[PDB]
Amino acid sequence: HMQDEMYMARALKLAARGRFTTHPNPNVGCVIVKDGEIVGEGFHYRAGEPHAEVHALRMAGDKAKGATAYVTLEPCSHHPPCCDALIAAGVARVVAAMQDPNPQVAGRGLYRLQQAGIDVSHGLMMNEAEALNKGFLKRMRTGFPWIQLKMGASLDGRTAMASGESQWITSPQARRDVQRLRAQSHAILTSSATVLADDPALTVRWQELSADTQALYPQENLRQPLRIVIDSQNRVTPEHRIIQQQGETLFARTHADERAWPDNVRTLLVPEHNGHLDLVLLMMQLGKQQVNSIWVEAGPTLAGALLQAGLVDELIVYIAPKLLGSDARGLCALPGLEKLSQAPHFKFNEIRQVGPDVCLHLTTA
Amino acid sequence: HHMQDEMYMARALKLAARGRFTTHPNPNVGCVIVKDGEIVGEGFHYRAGEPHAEVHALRMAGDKAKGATAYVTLEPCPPCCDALIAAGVARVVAAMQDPNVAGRGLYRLQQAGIDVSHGLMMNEAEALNKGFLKRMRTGFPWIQLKMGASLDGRTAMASGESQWITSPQARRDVQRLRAQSHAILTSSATVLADDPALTVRWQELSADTQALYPQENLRQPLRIVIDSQNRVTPEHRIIQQQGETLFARTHADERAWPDNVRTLLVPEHNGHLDLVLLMMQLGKQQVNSIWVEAGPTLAGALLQAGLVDELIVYIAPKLLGSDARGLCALPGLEKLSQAPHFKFNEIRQVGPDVCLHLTTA
Numbered sequence: 001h002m003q004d005e006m007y008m009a010r011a012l013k014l015a016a017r018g019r020f021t022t023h024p025n026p027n028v029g030c031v032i033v034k035d036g037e038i039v040g041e042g043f044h045y046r047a048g049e050p051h052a053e054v055h056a057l058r059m060a061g062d063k064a065k066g067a068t069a070y071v072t073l074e075p076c077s078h079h080p081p082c083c084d085a086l087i088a089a090g091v092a093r094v095v096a097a098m099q100d101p102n103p104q105v106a107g108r109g110l111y112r113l114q115q116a117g118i119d120v121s122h123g124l125m126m127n128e129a130e131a132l133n134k135g136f137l138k139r140m141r142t143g144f145p146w147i148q149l150k151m152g153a154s155l156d157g158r159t160a161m162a163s164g165e166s167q168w169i170t171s172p173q174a175r176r177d178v179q180r181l182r183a184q185s186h187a188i189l190t191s192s193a194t195v196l197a198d199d200p201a202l203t204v205r206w207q208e209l210s211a212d213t214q215a216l217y218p219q220e221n222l223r224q225p226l227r228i229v230i231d232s233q234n235r236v237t238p239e240h241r242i243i244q245q246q247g248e249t250l251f252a253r254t255h256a257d258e259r260a261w262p263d264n265v266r267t268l269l270v271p272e273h274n275g276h277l278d279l280v281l282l283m284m285q286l287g288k289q290q291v292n293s294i295w296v297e298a299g300p301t302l303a304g305a306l307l308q309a310g311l312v313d314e315l316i317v318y319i320a321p322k323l324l325g326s327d328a329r330g331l332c333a334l335p336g337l338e339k340l341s342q343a344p345h346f347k348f349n350e351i352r353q354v355g356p357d358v359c360l361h362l363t364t365a
Numbered sequence: 366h367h368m369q370d371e372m373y374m375a376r377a378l379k380l381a382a383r384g385r386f387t388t389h390p391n392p393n394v395g396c397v398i399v400k401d402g403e404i405v406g407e408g409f410h411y412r413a414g415e416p417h418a419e420v421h422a423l424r425m426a427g428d429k430a431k432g433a434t435a436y437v438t439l440e441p442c443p444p445c446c447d448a449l450i451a452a453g454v455a456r457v458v459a460a461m462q463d464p465n466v467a468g469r470g471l472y473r474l475q476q477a478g479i480d481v482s483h484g485l486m487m488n489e490a491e492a493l494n495k496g497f498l499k500r501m502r503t504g505f506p507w508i509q510l511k512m513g514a515s516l517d518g519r520t521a522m523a524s525g526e527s528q529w530i531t532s533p534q535a536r537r538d539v540q541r542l543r544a545q546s547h548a549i550l551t552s553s554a555t556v557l558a559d560d561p562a563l564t565v566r567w568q569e570l571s572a573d574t575q576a577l578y579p580q581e582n583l584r585q586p587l588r589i590v591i592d593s594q595n596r597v598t599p600e601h602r603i604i605q606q607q608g609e610t611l612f613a614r615t616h617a618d619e620r621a622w623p624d625n626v627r628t629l630l631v632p633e634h635n636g637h638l639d640l641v642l643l644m645m646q647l648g649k650q651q652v653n654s655i656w657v658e659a660g661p662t663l664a665g666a667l668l669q670a671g672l673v674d675e676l677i678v679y680i681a682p683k684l685l686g687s688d689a690r691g692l693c694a695l696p697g698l699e700k701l702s703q704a705p706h707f708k709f710n711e712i713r714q715v716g717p718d719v720c721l722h723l724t725t726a
């Protein structure tokens with residue numbers, strides 16, 4: 001009972017090793033124990049690469065017979081199926097943190113293992129495994145990606161001065177944490193308002209990671225998250241930097257653009273609500289394209305639109321210990337809000353220190 | 366006895382904090398006397414004009430004070446130094462020297478054959494009387510600027526609707542911070558707009574604070590109203606409360622006011638009250654610390670004058686929008702370099718809100 005926890009906690013630690021590259025697949029860790037000794041260890045790293053169980057079963061070999069397998073997720077039961085691979089090695093019992101997120105296939109893998117005479121149990125540290133792939137978990141259950149809205153402002157909630165200077169409000173430590181969160185995200189999303197105003201690259205710069213992250217993230221394996229730009233009126237030109245970078249760029253247009261763009265640029269057509277791109281339908285279409293999580297680098301207009309649509313799953317707010325004044329740019333634009341009742345309400349979940357700044361994690365309450 | 370000295374000292378600092386609601390304008394001082402590894406004397410200063418902590422603790426000790434060790438959170442001073450020798454003491458441990466007479470008391474004890482040492486938990490003693498220490502060294506009170514706003518730094522909607530942005534827990538926390546402050550300062554703009562009382566309501570304290578603050582001992586902090594143009598009338602609530610009210614005027618008001626109201630005349634710089642000179646005059650009147658309930662204009666003026674020592678910011682998990690009123694008006698600020706700079710010291714949870722403590726360094 002206590003032995004299961006210790007071995008399992010290794011699997012979740014292993015599963016987190018590939019959180020930068022597993023998309024659109026989840027993070028899964030597998031540990032195989034024979035006679036109280038770890039003979040098999042493996043984690044999923046890349047889509048189309050071997051799964052964690054196959055990685056760990058290869059390490060075990062013959063020593064996998066009658067052994068105990070600890071997996072952070074219920075093994076695949078559809079093709080080769082990881083469940084059958086476990087049986088082909090002679091494993092006697094399997095411990096899974098949680099069932100499959102998909103209701104269509106939830107419990108199938110455990111059942112097939114049990115039918116062939118294997119002790120099966122699920123539930124151990126389920127919440128910790130659920131937190132590992134929050135985007136993937138949400139997509140399978142709802143069809144919507146997990147949305148993280150990033151906000152960086154001074155003490156008085158200001159994102160830029162009246163002159164427009166927004167450089168170095170947050171500490172260099174804060175930007176760098178942003179890069180770590182960018183690298184774990186399946187996609188990075190912005191609006192044409194931000195693209196036209198700042199001309200950003202909005203990419204993950206490997207040289208800007210921490211030494212801890214750099215050790216578990218080889219540079220030649222750098223996966224640039226797909227960049228999504230909301231452009232209802234096709235205002236972004238093919239000369240902006242965001243499409244001149246390495247990696248993919250998805251443009252959410254309401255009508256097709258007639259210009260010639262770089263090959264890394266693609267176009268997604270979203271129906272229009274009122275006179276603006278329908279954010280709700282865009283998230284649904286992105287879910288159909290197997291997008292797990294979205295990191296949103298948005299200005300005040302896009303932030304308010306997502307919040308008023310009820311699409312934001314998590315607020316990540318960086319606050320610097322500086323005061324900018326009342327004519328400095330605000331945080332989010334909420335057109336229509338005139339009474340205190342209509343103000344958006346959230347809940348403080350995690351408060352952590354990032355250098356001289358603080359980072360507040362919030363969920364939509 | 367290095368660790369043994371710490372345990373007794375932390376008891377003295379614990380005792381000294383017991384009178385932080387009533388000691389003004391005197392500092393908070395705690396005294397513990399140990400004889401043969403047993404605490405025979407314990408005392409803290411509670412009220413101005415009451416006995417000092419050494420007298421408090423020496424009285425309980427009695428004959429048991431002889432050859433004993435006294436732990437005091439501040440250098441001993443009728444002089445407390447002479448009182449200490451008159452009861453007989455072999456060793457004295459002080460957290461810190463006097464901010465001013467600094468070293469005279471230890472020397473006065475040392476000349477009479479007493480082992481004296483200072484330095485134990487100096488930082489902890491400094492945090493006990495930040496206002497009193499600063500006033501003695503500089504002549505200026507310690508200023509705490511309170512800010513309560515939404516996530517986007519908004520204190521009220523465009524219409525002015527400000528009701529219940531912060532939680533009821535935050536209001537109660539504010540009452541505790543008000544009760545420890547020597548004075549509460551505001552501007553005439555806030556008085557004319559909200560007609561506040563700006564008092565400490567004992568029924569709005571927490572049960573922990575209420576336990577250490579008997580109701581009949583309630584000390585109302587001095588209320589300071591900045592009224593450059595004497596716009597506040599004698600019908601506003603701020604002068605209808607129990608306790609004193611000090612008006613920082615640029616010219617004397619010709620009306621008749623209640624006896625609890627007094628007036629301080631502050632010189633004018635250009636066409637504005639010199640806030641710096643007002644702080645100097647308030648320090649000259651032995652005001653240790655000031656709790657500032659200010660609007661955007663007054664908050665910006667204090668910050669641009671470099672008078673704010675500590676930011677206490679309450680943030681609620683709500684967003685008010687870009688047409689909601691801001692926190693501080695900083696006219697002239699155009700480059701990030703001239704923006705006020707602070708450092709997060711303490712972040713704590715107050716119900717659904719958070720409270721961020723910041724210092725000007």
Ligand SMILES: [Zn+2]
Nearest residue numbers: 051053076082
């Ligand atoms: Zn598998």
Ligand SMILES: [Zn+2]
Nearest residue numbers: 417441442445
């Ligand atoms: Zn004394």
